[PDB]
Design a binder for this molecule. Structure first.
Ligand SMILES: O=c1ccn([C@@H]2O[C@H](COP(=O)(O)OP(=O)(O)O)[C@@H](O)[C@H]2O)c(=O)[nH]1
Ligand SMILES: O=c1ccn([C@@H]2O[C@H](COP(=O)(O)OP(=O)(O)O)[C@@H](O)[C@H]2O)c(=O)[nH]1
Ligand SMILES: [Mn+2]
Ligand SMILES: [Mn+2]
Lengths: 250, 247
């Protein structure tokens, strides 16, 4: 089955480094379609070039981000729109799969770490599948508790009230189910930490989640974050007109 | 031309995540032998297990530092010089007089596949720009007519080799020829790279790569320390994250 990976991304110092490791990870996975959505006003040459050189099956999308500061909400919904035939492709495969097509959708942020094994775990998803996520929610790992092959609770701690106390990287959704539920999307007005539940609540009930990763006993994905690079020297050299050559992409 | 990637690593929350993306990066590169050296009291099942299922050609070494991975890299150089020390993987080092290149890759940087094809063509010591390092967008040598004539750097420009560990590679023959060349664990901040390279070549003889140093094919990324406030509170309640589930 084909896996459609939804990844929002925005320009910043570490952007290319993040897309390089994510695209290189994805090149190790067969039958995978990358839906990269840029948080810009139009496509950027940095992303367009990386996609073209990646050698992956991809569709390039773009949508600008308009209190709770949720991130990548609009970009994730744009990919859902494209999948539901509302267009929006600025590059790559312009046409989305038609109804009846078997597939699984995974929302993969550009900074997390993904093992190649994780993708084979989600390839078998009928509705909504789940697995533990490492280093997230202030825990060593957060994840569903499984008994008799069924989800019977959650190992979590922060905002335990969440109907689905799981990170974006801890679940995948069957394509048919998303097309079958046109209203299912992420709610930008949802409280902090309730973004995942805003989508999932429209798709299934916690009891019906499909445990993957050896009945949720293996951590195959990590919610890593990259340190903001120090630019003190760059600033001094710039004030002296000797900044790093801008013609050299980083 | 085989590339020997020397990588020091140590146990901490993000270790496995880092080794997963590094091993996955290396799985895309042909003719590569990974020399993973743990900074531990003894080999850990986590690392041994990851190496075994990586499908990569490797040698597993271990040496504790009572910390920049200096002692670990030197143990990889000792091994390369036939002094043994392997506790897993390929135990026999390359025979004397073999061809090859050595690259010192820390476990948290980001490496593009293209970077590795550049260094295979190393005669003595090759160099290239490194992104997000030394406080700059990128740091790298200035090339004129295929020759390094200077360095785009800022932080203490007095270093004879003002380049990050990720910005160079050494030909295996040259390392065997200079059996006394190794990292100085006492070298002050920022002088680690110079402590090795000074034993091998003159800055003027560095071989520029990455299209005469106009391309950034490696980035000095660092990973945030994960928040564990919730974990601590759960521990107090006797329900911390199951130790049997490796992270
Ligand atoms: O203004 C922004 C901020 C973030 N993102 C992206 O949206 C996702 C989530 O943000 P981030 O990884 O920073 O979230 P966190 O680490 O805090 O969950 C990532 O794929 C980012 O590249 C974006 O497109 N625009
Ligand atoms: O006690 C330690 C600290 C670090 N390292 C490793 O040595 C290298 C350099 O350290 P680090 O990445 O933290 O350096 P920086 O990013 O600050 O230059 C990395 O491969 C680490 O995994 C190690 O083996 N033992
Ligand atoms: Mn993130
Ligand atoms: Mn580092």
């Amino acid at each position: 089955m084909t896996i459609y990976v939804v990844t929002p991304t925005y320009a910043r110092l570490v952007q290319k480094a993040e897309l390089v490791r994510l695209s290189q990870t994805l090149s190790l996975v067969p039958r995978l379609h990358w839906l990269l959505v840029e948080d810009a006003e139009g496509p950027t040459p940095l992303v367009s070039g990386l996609l073209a050189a990646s050698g992956l099956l991809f569709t390039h999308l773009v949508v600008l981000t308009p209190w709770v500061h949720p991130r990548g909400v609009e970009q994730r919904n744009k990919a859902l729109d494209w999948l539901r035939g509302r267009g929006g492709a600025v590059g790559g495969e312009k046409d989305p799969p038609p109804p009846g097509t078997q597939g699984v959708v995974y929302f993969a942020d550009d900074d997390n770490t993904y093992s190649r094994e994780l993708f084979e775990e989600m390839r078998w998803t009928r509705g909504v599948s789940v697995w533990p996520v490492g280093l997230v929610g202030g825990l060593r790992f957060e994840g569903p508790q499984v008994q008799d092959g069924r989800v019977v609770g959650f190992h979590t701690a922060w905002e335990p009230s969440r109907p689905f106390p799981v990170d974006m990287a801890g679940f995948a959704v069957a394509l048919p189910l998303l097309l079958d539920k046109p209203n299912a999307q992420f709610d930008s007005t949802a409280p902090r930490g309730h973004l995942e539940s805003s989508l999932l609540s429209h798709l299934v009930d916690p009891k019906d989640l499909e445990p993957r990763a050896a009945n949720c006993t293996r951590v195959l994905v990590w919610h890593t974050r990259t340190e903001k690079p120090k630019m003190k020297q760059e600033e001094q050299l710039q004030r002296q007109g000797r900044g790093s050559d801008p013609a050299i992409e980083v």
